Amino acid sequence: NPWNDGDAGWRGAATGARANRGRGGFRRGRQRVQVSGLSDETTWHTLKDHLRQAGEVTFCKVFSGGRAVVEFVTPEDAARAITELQASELEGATLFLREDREDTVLVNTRRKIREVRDAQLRARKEE
């Protein structure tokens, strides 16, 4: 956002509460499924663990109330997942799955089937 103008702030600062997350080891010496019904405590790691039973995942993000969005690797990873993991049980948070059959690219795909059919309808009306 413009008011931040590149300022990292305290989120990107070097505070002692930030190095705690860094459990690496300190060695070297410096199309998308919408899933609902989860628990807000459910980490994205558990999300990947559960839904990789169906197919591989590139990106996944949770939202408040259990809503979350998951992007698949391949269309086969989706075609299996759209119908297999429906109403499965995980951590007392039985999932409910919906799929955005319309995509930011698939809308432009629907534009032409709309317009040519509209031309056919116009030809019908003229006749």
């Binding site: 702030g9 505070t15 002692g16 509460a17 080891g25 060695r27 070297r28 010496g29």
Partner: protein, 218 residues
């Protein structure tokens, strides 16, 4: 007050302890006009303290060590936040973790100060908190109030990479960054470098040893 989002609690406590030490000394007031200025400064200080206590409440909700909330409550008392509606939350959270929190790993002077700052009615509303405060004032760390704010922050938050390194502290990181790329088989070189490193251990920060051990495994 601006741009203070996602603030770790230790940062807030250090800032409050910095603010308390730069306060003006009280003098006799000419009541003709300066009372208005006192009201204006009161209003501004309230506008700041309300944001500070909001952030403290968020920290209360998310869970925090008793030492940090203890110091923050003392500092806010130093600034005159006499509302008593937030001090009941203070007592509630302090009594929530009273069972397992260590007693002699806290500042006794801070204990006396917060015990005075907490109302007696609020005190005997929580006899367990009363007893805990007396125990801390009996057995606890001494002289922690006299340290400079940066010393307090360094001695309660290891690493944190805020203040710049002293001249001596740079030598340890030169040694470590020289040891990183050295071949493993060159045992004599590593022995010499480590024997050089141990000579300046008294001045190096305690946290950086995490790296000194790590390269040993490398």
């Amino acid at each position: 007050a601006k741009t203070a989002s996602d603030i770790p609690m230790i940062q807030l406590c250090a800032a409050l302890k910095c603010f308390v030490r730069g306060l003006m000394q009280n003098v006799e007031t000419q009541s003709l006009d300066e009372q208005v200025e006192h009201e204006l400064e009161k209003e501004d200080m309230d506008a700041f303290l309300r944001f500070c206590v909001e952030n403290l409440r968020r920290g209360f909700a998310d869970g925090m060590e008793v030492k940090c909330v203890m110091a923050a409550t003392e500092s806010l008392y130093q600034l005159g936040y006499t509302s008593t509606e937030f001090y009941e939350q203070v007592a509630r959270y302090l009594g929530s973790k009273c069972s397992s929190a260590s007693a002699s790993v806290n500042s006794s002077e801070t204990a006396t100060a917060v015990c005075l700052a907490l109302g007696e009615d609020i005190l005997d509303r929580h006899p367990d908190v009363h007893t805990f405060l007396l125990e801390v004032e009996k057995s606890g760390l001494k002289g922690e109030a006299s340290l400079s704010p940066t010393e307090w922050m360094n001695k309660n938050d290891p690493a944190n990479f805020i203040t710049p390194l002293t001249e001596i502290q740079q030598e340890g990181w030169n040694i470590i960054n020289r040891m990183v790329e050295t071949r493993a088989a060159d045992t004599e070189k590593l022995t010499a470098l480590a024997n050089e490193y141990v000579a300046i251990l008294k001045s190096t920060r305690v946290d950086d040893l995490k790296y000194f051990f790590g390269v040993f495994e490398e």
